[model samples]
Target: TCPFYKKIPGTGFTVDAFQYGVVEGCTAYFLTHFHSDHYAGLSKHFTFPVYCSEITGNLLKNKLHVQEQYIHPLPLDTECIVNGVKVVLLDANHCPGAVMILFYLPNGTVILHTGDFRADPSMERSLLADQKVHMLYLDTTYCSPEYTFPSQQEVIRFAINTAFEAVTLNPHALVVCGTYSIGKEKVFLAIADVLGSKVGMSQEKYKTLQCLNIPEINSLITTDMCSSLVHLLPMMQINFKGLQSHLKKCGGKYNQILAFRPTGWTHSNKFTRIADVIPQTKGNISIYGIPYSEHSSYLEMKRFVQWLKPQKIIPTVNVGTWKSRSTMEKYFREWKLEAGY
Candidate 1:
């Protein structure tokens, strides 16, 4: 089952609903980020004005090739008016252009839509401190207790240290870090910096990094594979077979390969500590599944919703099947009661 629910109830706007096609009575389309899943239906021929963060806007035009006229880029932490409705874009802390949207309708209704975000403690002290959100559209990808993991910084440090230890023992060993086109740049960037080596990446990913405009990352990229022992590859290519093929392509240059597969799904509840997580080793190819997630963990979501005390909570992900949605609904009810809302 697939869940692609869009349209914020009682409003004429839709968030990341392009794939749903032109919905009836949809006056505006708002995108949270540049992720494919969010912007699946968007294209050069799409209708309606699209609103998003400035960084996302740049990617839409340059990466997705969406026309400039259709894209409306808004500055972060600033209130803007669209269709006579008050709206604000807050940093999602997920990806570069990702944002959590706040809408103030003329009817006095306030809605907060978190397009895919990693909840931080500072959010409670920031603009969300005393605000009342009537409805909260949440990203419930990791809303179960089973999905908890270490903080991003902690996971990144663990990955870097693990790589350093492996390469220290075998200087000829290759370190390959898995990453997405948009998120998880910090991990590989930190590894490259700490190891004092350049990272080899595909031309497409390199271009995506250039679009990100991180000055430090500009110098960390290398075109020649032999120039750097560290390589940045797509997440799907971090498996044993992929590592073997990559090693084979490198010929006799590297002895072993250490791949860090960073994702929330890699986490296991059995591992209470970050360092306790295990790796899948097969011969010279070892893959460490680091819980480097951008989405809010189970406890993080519980605290966030309880703190906000939204009148209603609607999940954006995992809404397709009864079992999946009910799983989240149970938590929502418990949190609501605790919030006394």
Candidate 2:
């Protein structure tokens, strides 16, 4: 897409605006999530009424210092009308406060914009109603069968279990888990709550979690390094050289360092060496990869399109040129092969 925002012209919306053309084109803006790439060019200076989940609206205010008047919060699973366009925000199963967009046009036309999301059964039934969808704006991250991976819940369970096992085996070692600051806050938080220990991370992430005001996440702290605490760092923090850097700095204060990355790269199977690493590292520091992801894999995307059965699908990626349209034309039909839709 030349511009980031997507629009169903006769119906009304601004699904994740970036460039000025899309913003100035529509009166009401719809934001799918709070991710930086989703809201790339948004700023405190934006003046139009913006619609999104309450958490995203709060982030725009507290994190970006935006004025409250310009922000409009739409609670998930609720329907409302904006400028005569019926709208709803469906849970995206992405990071916190993410949502899939739904639009109901007066002419009985329906449109969907699946913001960065992983497919799961719990997604709202209303959105999947057995009715024709006029247009669909899809998230094409990992839009291939080779990308199949476990659900977010399943992957997080494996991550937490693996981390606990690492601690039980190397009681004197520091357990390190890597995550992006905005996404996957739940993985480390889940470990902390289950282990009855506090999660430690950088001060910036600490502040964002605290601002979220969720008690379990607030339990995550910046100064809590100790025998039982698991350290949460950026994904690159667990890479080879990064592990070596931490090893050089540990100075034997901790007996060993066990690191793991909870991500989808493992599912792609492209790496020469990365694999599950809890049981067998003799080295002082080691890293493992887990198949966790926030985006729907090709298998999941097939299910989503089959369930929704949109008449036309517009991909939200590979948009630097005509290839984006071609990607949709190629895969959308292939995805619907199992179902006539």
Candidate 3:
């Protein structure tokens, strides 16, 4: 029931993950991005040759402890032959090193596996330019109308504006933006550009971004955190009471803290796309969750299906449970019926 491999009528290519025992023998592996969930099943013993973007390759070595020989980094927009299939990498716009994989089969069928992306117009045009696609593996993380969100650009602007306002109003309060180990680099870079500060608190994150050598990111990183510094701390550790007590017991070195978390779960109803700016307090710190996501909403997903017009559409996120699988099959059929093809 898992969608990770193409064992049947799959044209002998694997995408994203290789966790289950049955998928381990697929031979060649293609990675969409570096999120832990996508690579959760990977291990030190993994010896399969992996093809992905150059940045993702480096991250594989540096962060995930992957061996160099087994990892192949492909330049974006370039076509290469891999085990008989012609493959091309397109910018996914999902995260720092994410990409959408497009491959040409021997029979003239072109298949697209959008790892985990929020498609933009230019990328969409590039994909469409590939001509007719036989099959599509969609990233339907937010495949319902309930998960609607603003564009990442709009979300970034709001986040930047919020950080600027926070620093200006409370100069002594440390500005901490929630983040994962990777992804969400835009939030930190934008903060640096607008506030004229560097990412000071999280050394590991700073180092990872620095190693990437992306000019846009390197220009914003700083080696030290001072009075006006900003930090991209992992959002998982955000406990209002814990932070408040820690800061308070430290003799008030940091007067207060302001946090900005960007996520798609901001909608309270969880049944429709509801976007807004609302703040919930956590003791001395205030947490604001912005309705920002890197996944497409239900309406956007429908539009994507209409545009691609694939012969078959496979949902990528839910594959293990009967309930989730039913949801996937339901959407797939409904989407096709609505597209009127």
TM-score of each: 0.94, 0.86, 0.89
Per-residue alpha-carbon lDDT of candidate 1 for residues 85-160, written as tens digits (9 for 90 to 100):
8899998989888999999988888999999999888898767765688988899988888887778888888888
Clashes of each: 0, 1, 1
Candidate 2 residue spans exceeding 4 A from truth: 1-5, 124-127, 213-215, 220-223, 226-228, 247-252, 267-282, 321-328
Q: State the lDDT of candidate 3 residue by residue for 1-341, as single tens digits.
A: 34543432445667765566446447687888888878766655678888888888877887777888899999888888888778888888787788988878887778888889886656667746758888888887877656666677777887788778887987777767777757767776787678887676556776677656588765577656553367666677566865565466446667877777766555563643323566788556888776667777777777777777899877777665788778777887887788777
How accurate locally, in lDDT, is each candidate? 0.84, 0.72, 0.73
Ranking by TM-score: 1, 3, 2
Query: What is the C-alpha lDDT profile of model 2 across 1-341, one tens digit per residue?
Result: 43533766675457777555454557887777778777877778877888888888878888877789988998777778889888878888887788888888888878888888888766636555645678888888877556666566776677678767767887666777887657776677777766667877666767676655465454455555543367877786777677677656656667677776776656345433223434335467766666667888787877878887778777787666676567657777776786875
How many backbone clashes are present in model 1? 0
Estimate the lDDT of model 1.
Answer: 0.84
The TM-score, computed over Cα atoms with residue i paired to residue i, of candidate 1 is 0.94
TM-score: the better of candidates 1 and 3: 1
Better of 2 and 3 by lDDT: 3
Candidate 3 Cα errors over 4 Å, as ranges? 1-10, 21-25, 245-251, 269-276
Q: What lDDT is reached at residue 234 by model 1? A: 79
lDDT of 1 at 104: 90
Question: Model 2 Cα displacement at 299 (Å)?
Answer: 1.0
- Name the better of 2 and 3 by TM-score: 3
